[PDB]
Design a protein around this ligand. Sequence first.
Ligand SMILES: NC(=O)c1ccc[n+]([C@@H]2O[C@H](COP(=O)([O-])OP(=O)(O)OC[C@H]3O[C@@H](n4cnc5c(N)ncnc54)[C@H](O)[C@@H]3O)[C@@H](O)[C@H]2O)c1
Ligand SMILES: NC(=O)c1ccc[n+]([C@@H]2O[C@H](COP(=O)([O-])OP(=O)(O)OC[C@H]3O[C@@H](n4cnc5c(N)ncnc54)[C@H](O)[C@@H]3O)[C@@H](O)[C@H]2O)c1
Lengths: 330, 330
Amino acid sequence: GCGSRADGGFRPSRVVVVAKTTRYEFEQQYSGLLERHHIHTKNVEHIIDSLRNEGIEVRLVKRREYDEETVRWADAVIAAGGDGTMLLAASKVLDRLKPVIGVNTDPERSEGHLCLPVRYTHSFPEALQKFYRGEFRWLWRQRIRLYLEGTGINPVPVDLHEQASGPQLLPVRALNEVFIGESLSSRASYYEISVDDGPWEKQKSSGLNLCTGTGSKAWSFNINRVATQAVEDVLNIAKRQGLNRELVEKVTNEYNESLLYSPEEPKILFSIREPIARQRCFSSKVCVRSRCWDACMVVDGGTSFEFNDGAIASMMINKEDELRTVLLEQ
Amino acid sequence: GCGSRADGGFRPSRVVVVAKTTRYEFEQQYSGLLERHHIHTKNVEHIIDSLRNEGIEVRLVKRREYDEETVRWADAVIAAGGDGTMLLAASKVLDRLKPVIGVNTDPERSEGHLCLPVRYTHSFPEALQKFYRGEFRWLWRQRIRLYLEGTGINPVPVDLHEQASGPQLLPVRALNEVFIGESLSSRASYYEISVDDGPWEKQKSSGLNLCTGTGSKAWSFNINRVATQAVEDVLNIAKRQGLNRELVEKVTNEYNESLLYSPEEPKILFSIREPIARQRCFSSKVCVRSRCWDACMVVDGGTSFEFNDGAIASMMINKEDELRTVLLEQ
Ligand SMILES: NC(=O)c1ccc[n+]([C@@H]2O[C@H](COP(=O)([O-])OP(=O)(O)OC[C@H]3O[C@@H](n4cnc5c(N)ncnc54)[C@H](O)[C@@H]3O)[C@@H](O)[C@H]2O)c1
Ligand SMILES: NC(=O)c1ccc[n+]([C@@H]2O[C@H](COP(=O)([O-])OP(=O)(O)OC[C@H]3O[C@@H](n4cnc5c(N)ncnc54)[C@H](O)[C@@H]3O)[C@@H](O)[C@H]2O)c1
C-alpha cells in the first residue's frame, strides 16, 4: 500500500544512466563472467536506446564518472545494474524531488529489490510509456543523515569500491544503513551509545547497524533473523520444559517479519551486532561516541568515514533526505 | 568433570612469563588508565617474586619479545594479563607436554575464563604450592590446525597486535577459533565450503567462525546466542498462533547452553555468520575455498593470514596440538 499515484506524467528531458561495473570489467582496471558482461551490456544498450527513441537526452557514466555535476544536469537518474547500483545512484542525489530509477540489468543472477520489476528490463519502453501516462506510484524512501563532531575528526569520505570541531553534516545519506565498527572484521568495537537522547551506555560488540525501512530487508535482516531450526529448538525446549513443521515455519516467518518495516516510516532500526556480556530497538535519533583505535562508518556499503576515539556521530531522519523512487504495476 | 589429576608434582626449573601490554603502555609505542597499569604491573611483580622465591628461574617478556626460542628455553609458560594474553602465550606453544598457565593480573576489570581463579592472583605462592604437591588437574584443551594450499597463497602470518602450491601447515593453532572472511568489516564474503568432506556449497555471508570447545564460550557464543526477548517473542508468537519470566529465562539459558561444549571434545563448531539468502553444525574437518578479493584468516584474534581467490584452507583437530593447561581448586 506504499506510495502515492503520480499527479501527472513523468516526461524528462535529460537522464543520466549510471551503469554497474561488471565482474569482467573489474579486471580491466571465465566463460561465464564474459557472458554476464554481455547480458549486462546488452541490457544497458536496451535502456539507452529506449530513452533515446523517446527523445530523452542521455548520458552514460560509470562509477568513476558519476559526479554531482551530472546529477544536477539530469532531470532523473537511472541506475542500471542491481541494488548496489541503486545505492551508488542515490549516494549523489540529495534533492527529494529528483527521481531515481533502478533497472536490474541481469535478472537471472542479481535480483534486486530496489529496481523495477524484471519484466521492465526487457520491456523498458513499456516502463517509459507508463511513466509518460503517469501510470505509476511515487515512493519516497526515508534516508539517514549523519553528523560528525569531536576531536581529530576527518569528514572526507572514501569510496570503498575504488580501494576540536563543531557538528559536520556528512556528504552522503544512508538508504540501506549506517554501519559503525572497527575497520577490521575480527576486532571488537568499543563505543558509548545514546538512543533518543538517553543516557550513554558503554558497549563492546562487533559493530552497530543503523538501518531504514528500506534497509531493514538488507544487512539488518541477516543480522537479526532467526532460523527455522532455532525456533524449533526454542519450542522443543519449551515443550520439554513446560509441534508441526508448518506451525514451526510460521512462527519463524512471523518473527522474521517483525524485523521488517515500511520504507516510508521515519524511524531507525538500531541493532547492536553480536554484543559482548537492548540489542535492537526503533528510534528517531542515535548518537555514538567512538572509543576504538581504527574504526569507520560505512554508509550503504560503499562510502567510508574515519571514526576514531573522541569522534561523535549522530544519525537521524530528515524529510529533505527522502529519495524519490517509483513503483510500477507488475 | 574435566581433566585428570596430576600424576606427580609440578616443579619447573625455568619459566617464561609473558605479560600483557597495558592500555597505558600502548601509547609509549586518564587517571584510571595509569591505575590499571599500576594494578597490572604490581601483580606481575607479585608473580615474578613468587616464582623466584621458590627458586624458579624466570624470564619476563612482552609480546614483541616472546619468541619461539624463549618457549623452548622454558619448562612452562605463564601468561600474565587476561584471556588475550593466554591466547598470545599459546600461539607459540606447539608441544602438547609444555604447560601454559594464565594469571588474571586485573581481576576487577578483565575477568578471564582461561586463567586461574582470581584468588590465585593475590595468593600466587599458594598456587605454586598446589603445583608442587600435585594438587591440581591437567586439562588438555583441543586446538585447531590450519592447512593452506592453492594458487597465489601467502603462508606468512601477520601479528594484528603490531599493525600453485601443495598443502602448507600454518605456524599457529587456534585455541578459540579460526575466523574466515573479508578483511573489511562491511564487505560480505564469498566462498565455497565443504564440511566433513561433503559437497561444496557456495556461500555469501559476513564470515565463518570455526571454534573449539574452549572457543565456544567466546566469539561463537555471541554469534549464536539468542536473547531472552527473542525467545519471549517466539513463544508469544507460538502461544498466539497456537508464559512466566522464569520459564522464559530458562528456555533461553537451556538454548544458549547447547551452544557450549567441552574443551576436551575434538570437534569444531562451524558457524556461518549472517548468511545471505546449515548455519551451524559440529564437525571434524572443514575446507574453505576462498572466492573473495581481500580476505584473511584470523586465528584467535591476533594472527592473520591472507586468504584470496584460489586459496584453499582445511581446518581439523590433531592430538599433537592439545594445549596443556591446569585446573586449580578454588
Ligand atoms: N547480509 C550481510 O551479511 C551483509 C554484509 C555486508 C553488506 N550487506 C548489505 O549490502 C549492502 C550493499 O550492497 P552491495 O552494493 O555491496 O551489493 P552486494 O551484491 O555485494 O551485496 C548486497 C546484497 O543485498 C541485496 N540488497 C541490497 N540492498 C537491499 C535492500 N535494501 N533490500 C533487499 N536486499 C538488498 C543485494 O541485492 C545483494 O543481494 C549494504 O548496504 C548492506 O546492507 C549485507
Ligand atoms: N564477541 C565478539 O563479538 C567478538 C569479536 C571479536 C573477537 N572476539 C573474541 O576475542 C578473542 C580474542 O580476544 P582478545 O585478546 O582480542 O581480547 P579482548 O579483550 O579484545 O576481547 C576478548 C573478550 O572475550 C573474552 N574471551 C576470550 N577468549 C575467551 C574464551 N575462550 N572463553 C570466554 N571468554 C573469552 C575475553 O575475556 C574478553 O572479554 C577472539 O578469539 C574471539 O573469540 C569476540
